[PDB]
Amino acid sequence: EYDLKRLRNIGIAAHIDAGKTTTTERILYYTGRIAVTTCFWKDHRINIIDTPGHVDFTIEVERSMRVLDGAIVVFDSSQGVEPQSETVWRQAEKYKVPRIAFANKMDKTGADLWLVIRTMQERLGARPVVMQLPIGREDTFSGIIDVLRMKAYTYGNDLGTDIREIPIPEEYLDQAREYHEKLVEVAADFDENIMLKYLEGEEPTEEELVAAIRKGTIDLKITPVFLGSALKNKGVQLLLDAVVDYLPSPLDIPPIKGTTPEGEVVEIHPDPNGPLAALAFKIMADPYVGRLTFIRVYSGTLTSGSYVYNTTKGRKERVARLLRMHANHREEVEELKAGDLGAVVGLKETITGDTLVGEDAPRVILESIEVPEPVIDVAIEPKTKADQEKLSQALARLAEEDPTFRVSTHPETGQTIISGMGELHLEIIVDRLKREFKVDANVGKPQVAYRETITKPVDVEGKFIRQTGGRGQYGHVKIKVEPLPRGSGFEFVNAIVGGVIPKEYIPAVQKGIEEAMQSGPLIGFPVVDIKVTLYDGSYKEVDSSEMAFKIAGSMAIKEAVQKGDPVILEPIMRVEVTTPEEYMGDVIGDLNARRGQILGMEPRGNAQVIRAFVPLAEMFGYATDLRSKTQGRGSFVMFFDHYQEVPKQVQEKLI
């Protein structure tokens, strides 16, 4: 039943509209006749892993690529590797994932196989090796020639229900012999035994070839290529074969790496008997069973009805059931062994990124712990409260699956404000808002979340003394406000000596300080990184109140941040641009005019990779500035890094 060798853990990467969904639907179908979906082909368990909706989704991508072992990259035979198709490739390259390739849509007009092969060779530097030729051109496209084995299959309809092996037609007999030769010439690069047979012109054996091509695929040197039309059902069974021949099992890729509690790195082996280590990569809210938290298992066995320690978060979780999702049904299983993926039921306080271990087995983490700061805000004016009522429920329901964002109510516009770690993040949340959770609102343009703070210690005071509301009000506080090292946040001390301020009012003061740190004086963004010591004041015996000392506190914070040489803090993003070698300096220059700070350029593949420190505020609509400077071919990722005082002229320009 469970045999690692015969496990094939895959995802499908493709341009948008290239054919990922159709190809996936079609695979499921063919493996039918008897977040992570499971099926069987020729005694192999193929766990198709769902790869992000768009490639820019950078956090999900990284995580969904160490959850898979090998990938199928799908190109539109009409257009070639369309500049975003280069970008999905760079992904696989980046995460060192063994891959095959699939020239989809060989049935449409414009479908050129050779365009794909060439563009793969030239642009991506991929080393395609042709493993089949198409019999036919457009609508004429009817057959597919396996040049490894020198056979040919023909398709008697566009339904998937008539595949007959035929000899290669003599019209394609030259071309096939030609490409078989190329294949055997390649295979010999990875098998010495095949080298001494290619000399002799002694046709080596299918075992040898397949093994050789495979070794090459898995060690990231070659990229076999197959074609077909997933829509008109041709080539999807051979593509499925390909998965089982050339794509890696968990035994084939190097073991994932994990961090002990002492910052140390451990290599983590697929030994199904050894300790347990799982990584959770998606949470979903299934109707018939509640919340499913999908995991991938690296070592040991995860047994249904058992307890696992969540090393990311400190608690234990109850593994109630274990599931496998199939195309058309679910399946309860007793265990998921090392090399496998499923869903688990139970697990109240487990979220994605988190690491599940064997309870009394070594505590290791598998990702980074730090939380991306909420660096981009968006305002939404809800409809007529009839939407707010289902908005608010949804937004708080959004945070049952996602803790990487914050919800606030703006101190002085009334609006509801979402905060995230980038724009796309928010763009997809709004997507889930007006559709999935059905909500409507006047959405605002995304903006950078700045922060204020003071650069020098001050010693101010606050007085509120009025005859409002019928009675007499009075509250007097004196504070010392001093700057706190970056990222330290807030600190309050009470140092009031002896009823100088009546104990009842100290809370009211604090509230006042708190409610007024929410709007700095430079641009009305939250004050941060300061220490507030309440050290004096006065009351008037009947006139004082809570309202009074609230405002007094508030009025002294507004003073302390005006006198303290206030400065604005901006978020500084860590940027990695992937560009073809040619645009290097023409791209570096553009980063350098964004107040960037180049940290060094090493090459990845044939492309090059620049590292920088560009501030978030010099980045809005960056992707269209890359596609203008890289002939469409470049791309970039972006992560928070640190807040930095704005430079003099940017302070002035932001006021």
**Which one of the spans 14-22, 190-198, 241-249, 472-480 is the region binding ligand GDP (CB under 6 A)?**
14-22
Three-state DSSP class for 642? strand
Task: Report the residue from 17, 21, 203, 488 that binds Mg ion according to the rule CB under 5 A.
Answer: 21
Among 6, 108, 486, 627, interactor with ligand GDP by CB under 6 A: 108
Cβ 321 to ligand GDP shortest distance, Å: 31
Stretch that binds ligand GDP, among 224-232, 304-312, 342-350, 384-392 (CB under 6 A): 224-232
CA-CA distance, 433 to 271, in Å (whole number)?
A: 43
Determine contact, residues 148/210, Cβ cutoff 8 Å. Answer: yes
* Residue 180 assigned as binding residue: no
17 binds ligand GDP (CB under 6 A): yes
CB 418 within 8 A of CB 378: yes
3-state helix, strand and coil shares in percent for the chain, rounded to the nearest 5: 25, 35, 40
Write the single-letter amino acid at 173.
L
User: How far is CA 523 from its chain centroid?
Assistant: 32
Residue 320 is inside which H or E element, if any? strand 316-325
CB of 76 to ligand GDP, least distance (A): 8
Residue with tokens 């257009």: 79
Please, what is the minimum distance in Å from the beta carbon of residue 105 to ligand GDP? Answer: 4
Helix (H/G/I), strand (E/B), else coil: 625: helix
Rounded to a whole number of angstroms, the minimum distance from the CB of residue 22 to Mg ion is 8
CA-nearest of 131, 103, 95, 124 to 14 is: 103
70 labeled part of a ligand binding site: no
Quick one: which segment of 9-17, 120-128, 248-256, 411-419 binds ligand GDP (CB under 6 A)? 9-17
Cβ proximity to ligand GDP: between 56 and 107 the closer is: 107
CB contact set of 277 (below 8 Å; sequence gap of 6+): 258, 268, 297, 298, 299, 300, 355, 356, 357, 358, 361, 364, 366
Which of 5, 21, 386, 631 is in the footprint of ligand GDP by CB under 6 A? Answer: 21
Range 329-388, binding ligand GDP (CB under 6 A): none
**CA 309-325-65 angle, 5° bins:** 65
Residue 106: CB minimum distance to ligand GDP, A: 7
We find the least distance from the C-beta atom of residue 22 to ligand GDP, in angstroms, to be: 4
Q: What is the Cα–Cα distance from 609 to 214, expressed in whole angstroms?
A: 29
Among 56, 86, 107, 252, binds ligand GDP (CB under 6 A): 107
- The least CB distance from residue 552 to ligand GDP, in Å, is 60
Q: Are strands 128-130 and 223-228 parallel, antiparallel or unpaired?
A: parallel
The binder of 231, among ligand GDP, Mg ion, none, by C-beta within 5 to 8 A per type, is ligand GDP
Q: For residues 313-330, b (16+ Cβ closer than 10 Å) or e, as one string?
A: eeeebebebbbbbeeeee
- The residue from 7, 13, 18, 556 that contacts ligand GDP (CB under 6 A) is 18
The window from 18-26, 387-395, 451-459, 618-626 that contacts Mg ion (CB under 5 A) reads 18-26
Measured distance CA(222)–CA(189) in Å, rounded: 10
Of 142 and 518, which has the nearer Cβ to ligand GDP? 142
Give CA separation, 420 vs 352, 405, 482, 527, 626, in Å. Answer: 17, 5, 29, 19, 23
Nearer CB in complex with ligand GDP: 103/439: 103
Residue 431 in the binding site for Mg ion (CB under 5 A): no
- Smallest distance from ligand GDP to CB 37, Å: 15
* C-alpha distances in Å from residue 409, one per residue of 184, 516, 568: 66, 14, 22
Number of H helices, E strands in the chain: 15, 36
Count of residues near Mg ion by CB under 5 A: 1
Copy the structure tokens of residue 17: 């509209």
Residue type (1 letter), 608: Q
Q: Which stretch binds ligand GDP (CB under 6 A): 229-237, 258-266, 285-293, 332-340?
A: 229-237
Residue 103 counted as an annotated binding residue: no
Stretch that binds ligand GDP, among 195-203, 226-234, 394-402, 423-431 (CB under 6 A): 226-234
Q: Minimum distance between the CB of residue 113 and ligand GDP, rounded to whole angstroms?
A: 13
- 14 labeled binding residue: yes
Residue 455 contacts which entry, Mg ion, ligand GDP, none (Cβ below 5-8 A, type-dependent): none
Q: Is 107 annotated as a binding residue?
A: yes
Total residues contacting ligand GDP by CB under 6 A comes to: 15
Q: Is 454 annotated as a binding residue?
A: no
- Which residue ranges make up the annotated binding site for GTP? 14-21, 50-54, 104-107
Binding site for ligand GDP (CB under 6 A): 14, 16-22, 104-105, 107-108, 229-231
- Which residue ranges make up the annotated binding site? 14-21, 50-54, 104-107
Binding site for Mg ion (CB under 5 A): 21
